[PDB]
mmCIF file of C-alpha atoms and ligand atoms in Angstrom:
data_model
loop_
_atom_site.group_PDB
_atom_site.id
_atom_site.type_symbol
_atom_site.label_atom_id
_atom_site.label_comp_id
_atom_site.label_asym_id
_atom_site.label_seq_id
_atom_site.Cartn_x
_atom_site.Cartn_y
_atom_site.Cartn_z
ATOM 1 C CA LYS G 858 -10.608 50.625 49.458
ATOM 2 C CA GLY G 859 -7.377 51.239 47.560
ATOM 3 C CA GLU G 860 -9.047 52.178 44.271
ATOM 4 C CA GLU G 861 -9.770 55.697 45.549
ATOM 5 C CA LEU G 862 -6.012 56.302 45.831
ATOM 6 C CA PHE G 863 -5.556 55.852 42.066
ATOM 7 C CA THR G 864 -8.233 58.371 41.054
ATOM 8 C CA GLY G 865 -6.294 61.068 39.231
ATOM 9 C CA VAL G 866 -2.500 61.090 38.891
ATOM 10 C CA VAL G 867 -0.041 59.795 41.499
ATOM 11 C CA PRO G 868 3.786 59.853 41.396
ATOM 12 C CA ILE G 869 5.870 56.744 40.749
ATOM 13 C CA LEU G 870 9.371 55.768 41.892
ATOM 14 C CA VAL G 871 11.138 52.630 40.642
ATOM 15 C CA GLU G 872 14.510 51.337 41.854
ATOM 16 C CA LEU G 873 16.116 48.173 40.480
ATOM 17 C CA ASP G 874 19.286 46.349 41.535
ATOM 18 C CA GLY G 875 20.285 43.645 39.075
ATOM 19 C CA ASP G 876 23.038 41.101 38.525
ATOM 20 C CA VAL G 877 23.271 39.274 35.182
ATOM 21 C CA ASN G 878 26.155 36.779 34.996
ATOM 22 C CA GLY G 879 28.132 38.934 37.420
ATOM 23 C CA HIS G 880 27.429 42.163 35.525
ATOM 24 C CA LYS G 881 25.762 44.410 38.109
ATOM 25 C CA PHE G 882 23.662 47.482 37.370
ATOM 26 C CA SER G 883 21.164 49.860 38.951
ATOM 27 C CA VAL G 884 18.182 51.646 37.397
ATOM 28 C CA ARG G 885 16.264 54.569 38.922
ATOM 29 C CA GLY G 886 12.814 55.414 37.563
ATOM 30 C CA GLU G 887 10.669 58.508 38.020
ATOM 31 C CA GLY G 888 7.318 59.568 36.622
ATOM 32 C CA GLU G 889 3.568 59.638 37.145
ATOM 33 C CA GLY G 890 0.710 57.215 36.621
ATOM 34 C CA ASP G 891 -3.010 57.474 35.903
ATOM 35 C CA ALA G 892 -5.050 54.337 36.576
ATOM 36 C CA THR G 893 -8.338 55.996 35.589
ATOM 37 C CA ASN G 894 -6.993 56.507 32.052
ATOM 38 C CA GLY G 895 -4.714 53.453 32.059
ATOM 39 C CA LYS G 896 -1.492 55.333 31.281
ATOM 40 C CA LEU G 897 1.800 56.040 33.032
ATOM 41 C CA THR G 898 4.897 57.990 31.973
ATOM 42 C CA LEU G 899 8.317 57.121 33.381
ATOM 43 C CA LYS G 900 11.963 58.006 32.728
ATOM 44 C CA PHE G 901 14.414 55.301 33.804
ATOM 45 C CA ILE G 902 18.106 56.177 34.098
ATOM 46 C CA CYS G 903 21.000 53.771 34.589
ATOM 47 C CA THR G 904 23.099 54.923 37.549
ATOM 48 C CA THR G 905 25.990 52.448 37.129
ATOM 49 C CA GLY G 906 27.066 53.730 33.709
ATOM 50 C CA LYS G 907 26.219 51.495 30.750
ATOM 51 C CA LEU G 908 23.400 48.976 31.063
ATOM 52 C CA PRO G 909 24.646 45.415 30.375
ATOM 53 C CA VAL G 910 21.224 44.290 29.089
ATOM 54 C CA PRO G 911 18.850 45.756 26.491
ATOM 55 C CA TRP G 912 16.281 48.178 27.863
ATOM 56 C CA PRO G 913 13.275 46.256 26.409
ATOM 57 C CA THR G 914 14.239 43.247 28.548
ATOM 58 C CA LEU G 915 13.668 45.269 31.744
ATOM 59 C CA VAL G 916 10.325 46.826 30.756
ATOM 60 C CA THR G 917 8.204 43.973 32.113
ATOM 61 C CA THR G 918 10.167 44.096 35.377
ATOM 62 C CA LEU G 919 10.290 47.877 35.887
ATOM 63 C CA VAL G 920 3.453 48.422 38.588
ATOM 64 C CA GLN G 921 0.267 46.749 37.342
ATOM 65 C CA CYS G 922 -1.781 48.744 39.869
ATOM 66 C CA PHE G 923 -2.159 51.455 37.188
ATOM 67 C CA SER G 924 -4.507 49.293 35.104
ATOM 68 C CA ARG G 925 -7.754 50.631 33.638
ATOM 69 C CA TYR G 926 -10.226 48.120 35.023
ATOM 70 C CA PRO G 927 -13.719 48.839 33.624
ATOM 71 C CA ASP G 928 -16.676 49.253 35.953
ATOM 72 C CA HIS G 929 -17.874 45.726 35.118
ATOM 73 C CA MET G 930 -14.486 44.408 36.335
ATOM 74 C CA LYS G 931 -13.950 46.478 39.490
ATOM 75 C CA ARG G 932 -14.126 43.419 41.777
ATOM 76 C CA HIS G 933 -11.157 41.862 39.936
ATOM 77 C CA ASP G 934 -8.443 44.477 40.592
ATOM 78 C CA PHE G 935 -6.229 42.582 43.022
ATOM 79 C CA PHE G 936 -3.538 45.253 42.667
ATOM 80 C CA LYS G 937 -5.564 48.208 43.952
ATOM 81 C CA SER G 938 -7.217 46.152 46.709
ATOM 82 C CA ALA G 939 -3.810 45.448 48.277
ATOM 83 C CA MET G 940 -2.942 49.158 48.477
ATOM 84 C CA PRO G 941 -1.751 51.146 50.342
ATOM 85 C CA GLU G 942 -0.143 48.189 52.117
ATOM 86 C CA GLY G 943 1.171 46.962 48.767
ATOM 87 C CA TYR G 944 2.089 43.600 47.314
ATOM 88 C CA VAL G 945 5.131 41.540 46.327
ATOM 89 C CA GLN G 946 5.641 40.573 42.678
ATOM 90 C CA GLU G 947 8.031 37.720 41.859
ATOM 91 C CA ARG G 948 8.657 36.605 38.282
ATOM 92 C CA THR G 949 10.628 34.010 36.325
ATOM 93 C CA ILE G 950 11.417 35.312 32.829
ATOM 94 C CA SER G 951 12.626 32.401 30.681
ATOM 95 C CA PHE G 952 14.395 33.655 27.557
ATOM 96 C CA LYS G 953 14.352 31.102 24.747
ATOM 97 C CA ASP G 954 17.806 29.785 23.761
ATOM 98 C CA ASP G 955 19.400 32.065 26.374
ATOM 99 C CA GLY G 956 19.425 32.957 30.074
ATOM 100 C CA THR G 957 16.647 33.468 32.591
ATOM 101 C CA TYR G 958 15.600 36.407 34.755
ATOM 102 C CA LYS G 959 14.330 35.926 38.302
ATOM 103 C CA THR G 960 12.978 39.096 39.908
ATOM 104 C CA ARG G 961 11.471 40.056 43.259
ATOM 105 C CA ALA G 962 9.588 43.364 43.329
ATOM 106 C CA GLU G 963 7.945 45.193 46.236
ATOM 107 C CA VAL G 964 5.141 47.463 44.994
ATOM 108 C CA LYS G 965 3.657 49.589 47.775
ATOM 109 C CA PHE G 966 2.693 53.134 48.732
ATOM 110 C CA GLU G 967 5.200 55.312 50.603
ATOM 111 C CA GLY G 968 2.939 58.165 51.659
ATOM 112 C CA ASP G 969 2.010 59.736 48.326
ATOM 113 C CA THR G 970 4.372 58.059 45.820
ATOM 114 C CA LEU G 971 3.903 54.548 44.441
ATOM 115 C CA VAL G 972 7.247 52.826 45.072
ATOM 116 C CA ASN G 973 8.453 49.675 43.282
ATOM 117 C CA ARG G 974 11.808 48.373 44.540
ATOM 118 C CA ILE G 975 13.013 45.330 42.599
ATOM 119 C CA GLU G 976 15.856 42.832 42.927
ATOM 120 C CA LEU G 977 16.928 41.095 39.716
ATOM 121 C CA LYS G 978 19.191 38.088 39.145
ATOM 122 C CA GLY G 979 20.227 37.050 35.634
ATOM 123 C CA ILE G 980 21.889 33.684 35.086
ATOM 124 C CA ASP G 981 22.856 31.264 32.304
ATOM 125 C CA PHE G 982 23.164 34.067 29.746
ATOM 126 C CA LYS G 983 25.499 34.054 26.745
ATOM 127 C CA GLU G 984 27.813 36.904 25.780
ATOM 128 C CA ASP G 985 27.245 36.060 22.102
ATOM 129 C CA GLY G 986 23.487 35.829 22.684
ATOM 130 C CA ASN G 987 20.911 38.491 21.918
ATOM 131 C CA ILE G 988 20.734 39.668 25.553
ATOM 132 C CA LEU G 989 24.332 40.344 26.587
ATOM 133 C CA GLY G 990 25.113 41.193 22.950
ATOM 134 C CA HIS G 991 22.602 44.083 22.771
ATOM 135 C CA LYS G 992 21.322 42.616 19.489
ATOM 136 C CA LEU G 993 17.761 43.644 20.425
ATOM 137 C CA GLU G 994 16.523 46.877 18.886
ATOM 138 C CA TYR G 995 14.933 49.633 20.948
ATOM 139 C CA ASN G 996 11.307 49.586 19.751
ATOM 140 C CA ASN G 997 10.159 46.014 20.467
ATOM 141 C CA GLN G 998 6.475 45.533 19.645
ATOM 142 C CA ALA G 999 6.135 43.783 16.270
ATOM 143 C CA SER G 1000 8.207 41.339 14.230
ATOM 144 C CA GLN G 1001 7.947 43.443 11.027
ATOM 145 C CA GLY G 1002 8.401 40.469 8.725
ATOM 146 C CA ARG G 1003 9.712 40.970 5.196
ATOM 147 C CA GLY G 1004 8.471 37.697 3.696
ATOM 148 C CA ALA G 1005 4.866 38.718 4.359
ATOM 149 C CA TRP G 1006 4.950 41.574 1.841
ATOM 150 C CA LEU G 1007 6.903 39.402 -0.604
ATOM 151 C CA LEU G 1008 4.174 36.762 -0.360
ATOM 152 C CA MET G 1009 1.570 39.405 -1.189
ATOM 153 C CA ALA G 1010 3.811 40.457 -4.075
ATOM 154 C CA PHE G 1011 3.729 36.833 -5.246
ATOM 155 C CA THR G 1012 -0.064 36.538 -5.283
ATOM 156 C CA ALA G 1013 -0.208 39.940 -7.007
ATOM 157 C CA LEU G 1014 2.417 39.176 -9.663
ATOM 158 C CA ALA G 1015 0.941 35.701 -10.189
ATOM 159 C CA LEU G 1016 -2.403 37.213 -11.193
ATOM 160 C CA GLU G 1017 -0.635 39.686 -13.492
ATOM 161 C CA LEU G 1018 1.325 36.982 -15.314
ATOM 162 C CA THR G 1019 -1.797 34.802 -15.405
ATOM 163 C CA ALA G 1020 -3.674 37.702 -17.008
ATOM 164 C CA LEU G 1021 -0.976 38.063 -19.668
ATOM 165 C CA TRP G 1022 -1.006 34.286 -20.154
ATOM 166 C CA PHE G 1023 -4.769 34.381 -20.739
ATOM 167 C CA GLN G 1024 -4.347 37.108 -23.356
ATOM 168 C CA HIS G 1025 -1.206 35.967 -25.189
ATOM 169 C CA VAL G 1026 -1.815 32.180 -25.150
ATOM 170 C CA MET G 1027 -5.582 31.659 -24.900
ATOM 171 C CA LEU G 1028 -6.029 34.499 -27.447
ATOM 172 C CA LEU G 1029 -8.611 36.251 -25.239
ATOM 173 C CA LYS G 1030 -7.792 39.932 -25.588
ATOM 174 C CA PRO G 1031 -8.621 42.320 -22.724
ATOM 175 C CA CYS G 1032 -11.190 45.095 -22.555
ATOM 176 C CA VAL G 1033 -10.620 48.811 -22.041
ATOM 177 C CA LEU G 1034 -12.566 49.348 -18.821
ATOM 178 C CA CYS G 1035 -10.961 46.033 -17.836
ATOM 179 C CA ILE G 1036 -7.320 47.037 -18.444
ATOM 180 C CA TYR G 1037 -7.503 49.674 -15.686
ATOM 181 C CA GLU G 1038 -7.859 46.760 -13.253
ATOM 182 C CA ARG G 1039 -4.381 45.639 -14.343
ATOM 183 C CA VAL G 1040 -3.010 49.004 -13.210
ATOM 184 C CA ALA G 1041 -4.877 48.702 -9.904
ATOM 185 C CA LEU G 1042 -3.379 45.262 -9.301
ATOM 186 C CA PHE G 1043 -0.018 46.613 -10.456
ATOM 187 C CA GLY G 1044 -0.436 49.299 -7.801
ATOM 188 C CA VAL G 1045 -1.066 46.573 -5.231
ATOM 189 C CA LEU G 1046 2.079 44.752 -6.380
ATOM 190 C CA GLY G 1047 4.077 47.983 -6.292
ATOM 191 C CA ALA G 1048 2.858 48.617 -2.753
ATOM 192 C CA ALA G 1049 4.120 45.152 -1.803
ATOM 193 C CA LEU G 1050 7.593 46.043 -3.087
ATOM 194 C CA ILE G 1051 8.059 49.345 -1.240
ATOM 195 C CA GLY G 1052 6.619 47.674 1.853
ATOM 196 C CA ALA G 1053 9.152 44.853 1.495
ATOM 197 C CA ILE G 1054 12.197 47.067 0.851
ATOM 198 C CA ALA G 1055 12.503 48.454 4.400
ATOM 199 C CA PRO G 1056 9.542 47.461 6.592
ATOM 200 C CA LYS G 1057 11.384 47.663 9.926
ATOM 201 C CA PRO G 1058 9.233 53.258 8.357
ATOM 202 C CA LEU G 1059 7.763 53.960 4.898
ATOM 203 C CA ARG G 1060 5.475 50.932 5.305
ATOM 204 C CA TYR G 1061 2.579 53.353 5.839
ATOM 205 C CA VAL G 1062 3.244 54.766 2.364
ATOM 206 C CA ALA G 1063 2.950 51.242 0.965
ATOM 207 C CA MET G 1064 -0.176 50.553 3.029
ATOM 208 C CA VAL G 1065 -2.136 53.569 1.782
ATOM 209 C CA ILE G 1066 -1.055 52.754 -1.780
ATOM 210 C CA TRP G 1067 -2.300 49.216 -1.153
ATOM 211 C CA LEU G 1068 -5.464 50.687 0.379
ATOM 212 C CA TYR G 1069 -5.935 52.925 -2.663
ATOM 213 C CA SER G 1070 -5.137 50.422 -5.420
ATOM 214 C CA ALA G 1071 -7.540 47.889 -3.903
ATOM 215 C CA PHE G 1072 -10.291 50.508 -3.589
ATOM 216 C CA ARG G 1073 -9.745 51.497 -7.216
ATOM 217 C CA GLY G 1074 -9.933 47.801 -8.074
ATOM 218 C CA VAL G 1075 -13.328 47.331 -6.440
ATOM 219 C CA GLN G 1076 -14.547 50.451 -8.264
ATOM 220 C CA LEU G 1077 -13.425 49.361 -11.733
ATOM 221 C CA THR G 1078 -14.512 45.740 -11.280
ATOM 222 C CA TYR G 1079 -17.906 46.931 -10.016
ATOM 223 C CA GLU G 1080 -18.397 48.922 -13.221
ATOM 224 C CA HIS G 1081 -17.035 45.901 -15.101
ATOM 225 C CA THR G 1082 -19.781 43.672 -13.680
ATOM 226 C CA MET G 1083 -22.702 46.032 -14.332
ATOM 227 C CA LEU G 1084 -21.709 46.442 -17.990
ATOM 228 C CA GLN G 1085 -21.351 42.675 -18.472
ATOM 229 C CA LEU G 1086 -24.470 41.720 -16.480
ATOM 230 C CA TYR G 1087 -26.975 44.332 -17.634
ATOM 231 C CA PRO G 1088 -28.123 44.537 -21.276
ATOM 232 C CA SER G 1089 -25.295 45.933 -23.369
ATOM 233 C CA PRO G 1090 -26.384 49.192 -25.064
ATOM 234 C CA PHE G 1091 -25.044 47.712 -28.346
ATOM 235 C CA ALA G 1092 -24.935 51.281 -29.712
ATOM 236 C CA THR G 1093 -22.134 52.568 -27.447
ATOM 237 C CA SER G 1094 -19.155 51.950 -29.727
ATOM 238 C CA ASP G 1095 -15.853 50.414 -28.659
ATOM 239 C CA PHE G 1096 -13.159 52.093 -26.574
ATOM 240 C CA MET G 1097 -9.431 52.569 -26.083
ATOM 241 C CA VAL G 1098 -7.368 53.504 -23.045
ATOM 242 C CA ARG G 1099 -6.989 57.141 -21.990
ATOM 243 C CA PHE G 1100 -3.782 57.029 -19.954
ATOM 244 C CA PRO G 1101 -2.124 60.265 -18.789
ATOM 245 C CA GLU G 1102 0.307 62.007 -21.114
ATOM 246 C CA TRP G 1103 3.410 61.503 -18.963
ATOM 247 C CA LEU G 1104 2.527 57.806 -18.462
ATOM 248 C CA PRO G 1105 1.842 56.119 -21.832
ATOM 249 C CA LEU G 1106 1.774 52.602 -20.402
ATOM 250 C CA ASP G 1107 0.015 51.394 -23.554
ATOM 251 C CA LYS G 1108 2.786 52.983 -25.642
ATOM 252 C CA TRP G 1109 5.657 51.845 -23.399
ATOM 253 C CA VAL G 1110 4.563 48.241 -22.764
ATOM 254 C CA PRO G 1111 1.850 47.555 -25.378
ATOM 255 C CA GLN G 1112 1.505 43.832 -24.628
ATOM 256 C CA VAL G 1113 0.244 44.459 -21.075
ATOM 257 C CA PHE G 1114 -1.811 47.663 -21.483
ATOM 258 C CA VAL G 1115 -3.573 46.694 -24.710
ATOM 259 C CA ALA G 1116 -7.369 47.066 -24.514
ATOM 260 C CA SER G 1117 -7.864 45.628 -28.002
ATOM 261 C CA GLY G 1118 -11.476 44.608 -27.545
ATOM 262 C CA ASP G 1119 -14.217 45.942 -25.312
ATOM 263 C CA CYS G 1120 -16.287 45.007 -22.268
ATOM 264 C CA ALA G 1121 -20.017 44.186 -22.095
ATOM 265 C CA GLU G 1122 -19.026 40.819 -23.607
ATOM 266 C CA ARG G 1123 -18.934 37.623 -21.545
ATOM 267 C CA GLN G 1124 -15.484 36.140 -22.222
ATOM 268 C CA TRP G 1125 -14.939 33.707 -19.343
ATOM 269 C CA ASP G 1126 -17.696 32.537 -17.028
ATOM 270 C CA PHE G 1127 -17.155 29.572 -14.723
ATOM 271 C CA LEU G 1128 -18.477 28.290 -11.393
ATOM 272 C CA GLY G 1129 -21.567 30.458 -11.856
ATOM 273 C CA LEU G 1130 -19.704 33.790 -11.978
ATOM 274 C CA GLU G 1131 -18.142 36.073 -14.583
ATOM 275 C CA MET G 1132 -14.604 37.377 -14.981
ATOM 276 C CA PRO G 1133 -15.340 40.834 -13.463
ATOM 277 C CA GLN G 1134 -17.220 39.179 -10.588
ATOM 278 C CA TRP G 1135 -14.192 37.097 -9.585
ATOM 279 C CA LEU G 1136 -11.884 40.125 -9.744
ATOM 280 C CA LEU G 1137 -14.423 42.138 -7.742
ATOM 281 C CA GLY G 1138 -14.118 39.542 -4.988
ATOM 282 C CA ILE G 1139 -10.330 39.461 -5.305
ATOM 283 C CA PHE G 1140 -10.044 43.241 -4.972
ATOM 284 C CA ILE G 1141 -12.507 43.158 -2.074
ATOM 285 C CA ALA G 1142 -10.294 40.489 -0.502
ATOM 286 C CA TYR G 1143 -7.285 42.733 -1.143
ATOM 287 C CA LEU G 1144 -9.142 45.714 0.328
ATOM 288 C CA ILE G 1145 -10.389 43.730 3.332
ATOM 289 C CA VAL G 1146 -6.906 42.391 4.090
ATOM 290 C CA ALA G 1147 -5.581 45.928 3.617
ATOM 291 C CA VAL G 1148 -8.195 47.191 6.080
ATOM 292 C CA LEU G 1149 -7.420 44.362 8.515
ATOM 293 C CA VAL G 1150 -3.713 45.249 8.480
ATOM 294 C CA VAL G 1151 -4.553 48.860 9.359
ATOM 295 C CA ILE G 1152 -6.843 47.881 12.239
ATOM 296 C CA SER G 1153 -4.232 45.337 13.355
ATOM 297 C CA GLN G 1154 -1.550 48.009 13.852
ATOM 298 C CA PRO G 1155 -2.976 49.380 17.155
ATOM 299 C CA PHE G 1156 -3.501 45.913 18.664
ATOM 300 C CA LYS G 1157 -0.527 44.310 16.880
ATOM 301 C CA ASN G 1158 1.945 45.835 19.352
ATOM 302 C CA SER G 1159 0.225 44.913 22.639
ATOM 303 C CA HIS G 1160 0.768 41.846 24.825
ATOM 304 C CA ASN G 1161 -1.862 40.213 27.046
ATOM 305 C CA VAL G 1162 -1.099 39.423 30.691
ATOM 306 C CA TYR G 1163 -3.400 36.525 31.505
ATOM 307 C CA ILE G 1164 -4.216 36.408 35.227
ATOM 308 C CA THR G 1165 -5.747 33.680 37.396
ATOM 309 C CA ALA G 1166 -6.673 33.470 41.067
ATOM 310 C CA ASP G 1167 -4.470 31.905 43.761
ATOM 311 C CA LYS G 1168 -6.739 31.653 46.803
ATOM 312 C CA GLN G 1169 -4.409 29.112 48.445
ATOM 313 C CA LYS G 1170 -1.802 31.868 48.882
ATOM 314 C CA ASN G 1171 -4.340 34.743 48.836
ATOM 315 C CA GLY G 1172 -2.721 36.112 45.682
ATOM 316 C CA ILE G 1173 -2.690 35.898 41.878
ATOM 317 C CA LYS G 1174 -0.611 34.294 39.140
ATOM 318 C CA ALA G 1175 0.037 35.608 35.644
ATOM 319 C CA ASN G 1176 1.593 34.208 32.464
ATOM 320 C CA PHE G 1177 2.484 36.031 29.249
ATOM 321 C CA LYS G 1178 4.999 35.936 26.404
ATOM 322 C CA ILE G 1179 7.074 38.777 24.955
ATOM 323 C CA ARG G 1180 8.812 38.624 21.565
ATOM 324 C CA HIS G 1181 11.772 40.996 21.284
ATOM 325 C CA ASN G 1182 12.811 42.073 17.790
ATOM 326 C CA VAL G 1183 16.414 40.995 17.299
ATOM 327 C CA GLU G 1184 18.584 42.951 14.898
ATOM 328 C CA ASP G 1185 18.480 41.376 11.426
ATOM 329 C CA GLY G 1186 14.953 40.049 11.845
ATOM 330 C CA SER G 1187 15.280 37.306 14.457
ATOM 331 C CA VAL G 1188 12.852 36.729 17.341
ATOM 332 C CA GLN G 1189 13.662 36.356 21.052
ATOM 333 C CA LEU G 1190 10.977 34.645 23.136
ATOM 334 C CA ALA G 1191 10.727 35.859 26.747
ATOM 335 C CA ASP G 1192 8.455 33.475 28.660
ATOM 336 C CA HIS G 1193 7.088 35.157 31.798
ATOM 337 C CA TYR G 1194 5.649 33.575 34.949
ATOM 338 C CA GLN G 1195 4.294 36.052 37.502
ATOM 339 C CA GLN G 1196 3.283 35.529 41.132
ATOM 340 C CA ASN G 1197 1.785 38.252 43.336
ATOM 341 C CA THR G 1198 1.151 38.212 47.091
ATOM 342 C CA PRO G 1199 -0.165 40.997 49.347
ATOM 343 C CA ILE G 1200 2.043 42.605 51.971
ATOM 344 C CA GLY G 1201 -0.594 43.874 54.387
ATOM 345 C CA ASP G 1202 -3.279 41.901 56.180
ATOM 346 C CA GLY G 1203 -6.281 43.701 54.679
ATOM 347 C CA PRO G 1204 -8.490 41.636 52.384
ATOM 348 C CA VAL G 1205 -7.771 41.677 48.656
ATOM 349 C CA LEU G 1206 -9.991 41.011 45.655
ATOM 350 C CA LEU G 1207 -9.295 37.551 44.231
ATOM 351 C CA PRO G 1208 -10.077 37.930 40.515
ATOM 352 C CA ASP G 1209 -11.420 35.491 37.968
ATOM 353 C CA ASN G 1210 -9.529 34.594 34.793
ATOM 354 C CA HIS G 1211 -8.897 37.848 32.915
ATOM 355 C CA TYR G 1212 -6.046 39.465 30.995
ATOM 356 C CA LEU G 1213 -4.344 42.863 30.977
ATOM 357 C CA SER G 1214 -3.900 44.448 27.540
ATOM 358 C CA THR G 1215 -0.556 46.253 27.811
ATOM 359 C CA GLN G 1216 1.074 48.327 25.068
ATOM 360 C CA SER G 1217 4.382 50.134 25.576
ATOM 361 C CA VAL G 1218 6.273 52.677 23.470
ATOM 362 C CA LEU G 1219 9.979 53.271 24.089
ATOM 363 C CA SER G 1220 11.542 56.654 23.324
ATOM 364 C CA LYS G 1221 14.654 58.672 24.157
ATOM 365 C CA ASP G 1222 15.389 61.974 25.872
ATOM 366 C CA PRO G 1223 17.411 64.047 23.353
ATOM 367 C CA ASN G 1224 18.923 66.070 26.238
ATOM 368 C CA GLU G 1225 19.995 63.196 28.529
ATOM 369 C CA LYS G 1226 23.573 61.952 28.203
ATOM 370 C CA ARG G 1227 23.134 58.971 30.541
ATOM 371 C CA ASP G 1228 21.978 55.492 29.567
ATOM 372 C CA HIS G 1229 18.227 56.011 29.904
ATOM 373 C CA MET G 1230 14.842 54.925 28.559
ATOM 374 C CA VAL G 1231 11.656 56.985 28.338
ATOM 375 C CA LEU G 1232 8.564 54.858 28.895
ATOM 376 C CA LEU G 1233 4.833 55.103 28.245
ATOM 377 C CA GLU G 1234 2.366 52.282 28.906
ATOM 378 C CA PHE G 1235 -1.289 51.600 28.098
ATOM 379 C CA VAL G 1236 -2.829 49.113 30.546
ATOM 380 C CA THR G 1237 -6.482 48.065 30.297
ATOM 381 C CA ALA G 1238 -8.225 45.044 31.805
ATOM 382 C CA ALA G 1239 -10.363 42.721 29.688
ATOM 383 C CA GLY G 1240 -11.608 39.154 29.517
ATOM 384 C CA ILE G 1241 -14.907 37.754 30.785
ATOM 385 C CA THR G 1242 -17.738 40.301 30.872
ATOM 386 C CA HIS G 1243 -19.838 38.271 33.362
HETATM 387 C C1 UQ1 Q 276 -7.364 39.320 -20.400
HETATM 388 O O1 UQ1 Q 276 -8.402 39.841 -19.618
HETATM 389 C C2 UQ1 Q 276 -8.022 40.307 -18.351
HETATM 390 C C3 UQ1 Q 276 -7.595 39.334 -17.256
HETATM 391 O O2 UQ1 Q 276 -7.579 37.957 -17.496
HETATM 392 C C4 UQ1 Q 276 -8.755 37.319 -17.089
HETATM 393 C C5 UQ1 Q 276 -7.189 39.832 -15.875
HETATM 394 O O3 UQ1 Q 276 -6.868 39.011 -15.081
HETATM 395 C C6 UQ1 Q 276 -7.202 41.338 -15.577
HETATM 396 C C7 UQ1 Q 276 -6.806 41.943 -14.226
HETATM 397 C C8 UQ1 Q 276 -6.602 40.898 -13.134
HETATM 398 C C9 UQ1 Q 276 -6.523 41.246 -11.876
HETATM 399 C C10 UQ1 Q 276 -6.320 40.183 -10.803
HETATM 400 C C11 UQ1 Q 276 -6.639 42.712 -11.492
HETATM 401 C C12 UQ1 Q 276 -7.629 42.308 -16.677
HETATM 402 C C13 UQ1 Q 276 -7.649 43.804 -16.389
HETATM 403 C C14 UQ1 Q 276 -8.038 41.801 -18.055
HETATM 404 O O4 UQ1 Q 276 -8.361 42.568 -18.895
#
């Protein structure tokens, strides 16, 4: 009957004593948690001076009882069922190509405040490594790869040069209503360049430009299909571009923005489709991938904590991986192995295989001169709907 304790907001207190290759430290956390909404705010402060490890490495160690378990998963919250007596949480965090954390936490209720006292032991770490070297950036949630935008710039520039190769070698001149599709693809390519300059801010500017240039591409190619599929009016005379005054792209680079020739004329048609029909699908593919990237951003930064039952020890086990963003683009794998056991003798809910969707944002207090870390977490349970 511990779920009734987490209705509303309850205070949190976190203390951590750690020792990593002899370097000792202490962290004191304070804040509040809301299990009904799946959030919790905390402000951790290092009390021994300067922290010898990056703050993101301690986030997983520094209270899964504040998870937003839906009503169809209420009988799977092992954390709340152990309260107020509490539970013990031991982990083994294996950092790839580096050391290994081994923690022992005691999460329980002390009257009205949820207390989590942890002992940490770091071993086999390297001073030149990404842990003891503080080479991990603060906001660790996504790799922010640069070669991904450059690869989209390749497939965008390849189509551009292929279009010019069709026109200047195969002697198939472009149409007017067509040519605008070159600008739309050029806007997609340009978005790939700004996005690849400094992706680790400003990427959103490149993404909306990519979103816009692809949507303009599906608009122009749609009109390009209807003119080429339906009976040509035959009386609507030919066309030329009408670029803006400040941007005479036909006057600046005439061999790319030409429009000598007009639409409503089937130039290429292969594999049962026309030239505007293939570009319509390409721009739709560009727009779909652009939409997928936007919808990915919320769930791109969250890690899943997969949980199984351990009825032999009347507890649970949990495995999950965490990739920390190293400075200069590298990745640091943190392999986690969790093991929870109740403290009290009251019965606990042994859950089926489910996972906890956890997303964390790290910030700073502009008026705190100590080594600190402001924390906010989003914990929601998901998995089998039964
Ligand atoms: C020479 O005719 C033309 C092409 O070659 C088939 C194009 O690829 C394109 C644009 C291609 C893409 C992928 C937007 C245009 C606008 C064009 O007029």
